[PDB]
Amino acid sequence: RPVGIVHVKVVRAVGLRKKDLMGGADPFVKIKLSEDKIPSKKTTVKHKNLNPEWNEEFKFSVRDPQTQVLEFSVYDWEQVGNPEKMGMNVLALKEMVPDEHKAFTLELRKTLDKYRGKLEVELLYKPFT
Ligand SMILES: [Ca+2]
Ligand SMILES: [Ca+2]
Ligand SMILES: [Cl-]
Ligand SMILES: [Zn+2]
């Protein structure tokens, strides 16, 4: 049974790597909560943009907050074929207090180097009682 909901705002990314022949990249972000079988969330694609701003908000059913971890994956949408990874990071749900607007800045890495940019996110945890 779920014990709370976390509110994730994907704010912006800064300093992404060029991944297209021209235009930079077409970034979007995939957000997955660990220990879960729900479809991951994806932001809008920000075509031809190496400093995209989304300010996009998602929410996730928390089952246990010291265990579960948020996975943020930044991909470059392709006109042909599948999007190509641009970097990822994780963020632990133990890193917050309920009812407080907490921001973070995650560095993008190949897996959990060459500066791959930053992803700014905000989290707000709210439990039931
Ligand atoms: Ca590309
Ligand atoms: Ca692309
Ligand atoms: Cl679009
Ligand atoms: Zn589009």
DSSP-derived secondary structure for the chain: ---EEEEEEEEEEESPPP-SSSSS--EEEEEEESS--SPPEEPPP-TT-SS-EEEEEEEEEES-TTT-EEEEEEEE--SSSS-EEEEEEEEETTS--BT--EEEEEEPBS-------EEEEEEEEEE--
Q: How far is CA 70 from the centre of its chain?
A: 8
Beta partners for 14? Answer: 118
State in Å: Cα 55 to ligand 1 middle: 23
| Total number of domains in the chain | 1
State in Å: Cα 43 to ligand 3 middle: 10
Beta partners for 60? Answer: 6
- Which value in Å is the resolution of this experimental model? 2.1
State in Å: Cα 90 to ligand 1 middle: 23
Technique used by the depositors? X-ray
State in Å: Cα 30 to ligand 2 middle: 15
Determine the structural domain holding residue 52 and report its residue range: 3-129
Q: Cα–Cα distance between 48 and 20 in angstroms, integer?
A: 9
Known binding-site residues equal 20, 26, 76, 78
